[PDB]
């Protein structure tokens, strides 16, 4: 379960896809509990429901029981069947008793998991 919310949105049958401004992708539990938030300043909506997110990505969590409480990076892609997500470009992933960051990341929001891949520093190091 969820919603998208945009202010301009472009769809063209021929490619089917869509372009949105300023989505706001909220995405709701069992019960319709808002769980996650996903901001970006541009998305393009596939066929498949793939969405690719462009320019200032946050991603927040909404409920109390997560360790996960944000992720940002310039760039990101989520399934929105399936929730699994993943960046290529550097990405910060803010949690309940320490911050990382590193480049690139796989996760998904229906577990509430995320791991960088590469390079990784976190906040409580030295």
Not at 4 to 11: G, R
Not at 111 to 124: G, P
């Amino acid at each position: 379960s969820y919603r998208l919310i945009a202010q301009h949105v472009e769809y063209y049958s021929d490619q089917a896809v869509s372009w949105f401004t300023q989505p706001v992708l909220t995405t709701f539990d069992k019960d319709k509990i808002p769980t996650w938030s996903v901001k970006a300043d541009k998305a393009k909506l596939t066929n498949d429901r793939m969405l690719y997110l462009y320019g200032h990505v946050e991603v927040n969590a909404l409920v109390p029981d997560s360790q996960l409480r944000r992720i940002t990076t310039d760039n990101a892609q989520i399934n929105l069947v399936t929730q699994d997500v993943t960046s290529e470009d550097l990405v910060t992933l803010y949690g309940t008793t320490f911050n990382s960051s590193g480049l690139k990341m796989r996760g998904n929001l229906r577990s509430k998991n995320a791991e960088l891949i590469e390079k990784v520093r976190t906040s409580y190091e030295i």
